[model samples]
Target: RTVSGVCADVSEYHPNIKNWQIESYGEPEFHTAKVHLKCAPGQTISAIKFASFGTPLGTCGTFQQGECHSINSNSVLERKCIGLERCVVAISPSNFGGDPCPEVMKRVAVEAVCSTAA
Candidate 1:
């Protein structure tokens, strides 16, 4: 979550955290949840602190609350969002590979830090 080279070159300086933001979405059980992650036009995602796809981080109560969460989702967002100035994401089992929690409501909460450049 701190200084790393997953996005930048291995030797390149890690991008500094500037304007960070958290975007979360919770749609109805019958509808899909789409979340958009963005930074300044020239800025990009410096780091992804925490992320969840199917765990009700209190923002999601549309469906029956259950002990279900995708452990792989936290890291999944890094690949989907890191280093990109803007990333479009649609919440679904397919996007997360497999459904860890079935027959329950789902949503997403992501913390994406922004930086202008390294």
Candidate 2:
């Protein structure tokens, strides 16, 4: 069992940890999750990192690449959220294309680092 509202865990394994926070969405048994990272107004998004597991599929435009068990969703998030005060990342089969692995529930995990633009 996990602490209430804590569906995932994150910690800095190295000594030189910087400004980073883990953001997650979707239920363990669900097929979709929308993870979002919020920042103060006018703060630019410096970087983003994320992963989706459990038979993930390519985004709609690149579904022909073939189904993959995992994907890096940061690029997807950056397209819609970068340079903004907040960003929303959608993790779902339909959102990407379709369920590559039918009946298999997946999860999305994200970490973001923020800073104002130069």
TM-score of candidate 2 relative to the true fold = 0.49
Indicate which candidate wins on lDDT: 1
- Evaluated at residue 44, the lDDT of candidate 1 is 67
- Which parts of model 2 have CA positions greater than 4 angstroms off? 1-33, 53-68
lDDT of 2 by residue, 1-118 (tens): 1111111212112234343445664333433345646766546665554444443344422222234454444446567665765766556555555554556545444545566664
Per-model CA lDDT versus the true structure: 0.55, 0.46
TM-score of 1: 0.60
- What is the per-residue lDDT of model 1 for residues 4-116, given as tens digits with 9 covering 90 to 100? 22111011122344444456754333235466566656676766655666644343222223367677866677778877778666666666787777776555665566766
Candidate 1: segments with Cα more than 4 A from true spot: 1-31, 59-66
True-structure RMSD for candidate 1: 14.6
